[PDB]
Design a binder for this molecule. Structure first.
Ligand SMILES: [Ca+2]
Length: 152
């Protein structure tokens, strides 16, 4: 009877909690929707990921969080600018900070595999995924352009 679950910080990942007598509801901001177990909010749309304002495509048909919580700068069609890293929108989209995104079914944070999802981060090179990051090695004679993410 005394219980307001919205006071629990685990409650309603990336959503707004509203207390109810024996439970609680999670209201999801625009572009997010409640997950199957109703513990949080995820964006399940698919769109292209871009390194620039939209251009310089680095992934195809990925989620907005996979794009924007990694090195993507814009996403989707029409283009949606990734939220800046010190905003409330980034907090909701990227609740684990950079490198990670919530699993769309369980909302548990998981590494983004940049090599699988954003292969354009190492074009012409060899990508190795890591936990929270990735590495790109360019083949002999070629060098990573830090700006376009192309080997040469
Ligand atoms: Ca990774």
């Amino acid at each position: 009877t005394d219980v307001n679950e919205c006071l629990d910080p685990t409650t309603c990942i990336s959503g707004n909690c509203v207390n109810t007598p024996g439970s609680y509801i999670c209201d999801c901001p625009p572009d997010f929707e409640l997950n199957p177990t109703r513990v949080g909010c995820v964006d399940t749309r698919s769109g292209n990921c871009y390194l620039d304002i939209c251009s310089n495509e680095i992934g195809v048909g990925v989620s907005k969080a996979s794009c924007c919580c990694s090195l993507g700068k814009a996403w989707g069609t029409p283009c949606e600018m990734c939220p800046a890293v010190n905003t409330s929108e980034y907090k909701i989209l990227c609740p684990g900070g950079e490198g990670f995104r919530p699993n769309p079914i369980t909302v548990i944070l998981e590494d983004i595999d940049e090599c699988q999802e954003l292969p354009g981060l190492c074009q012409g090179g060899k990508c190795i995924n890591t936990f929270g990051s990735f590495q790109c090695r360019c083949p002999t004679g070629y060098y990573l352009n830090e700006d376009t993410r192309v080997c040469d």
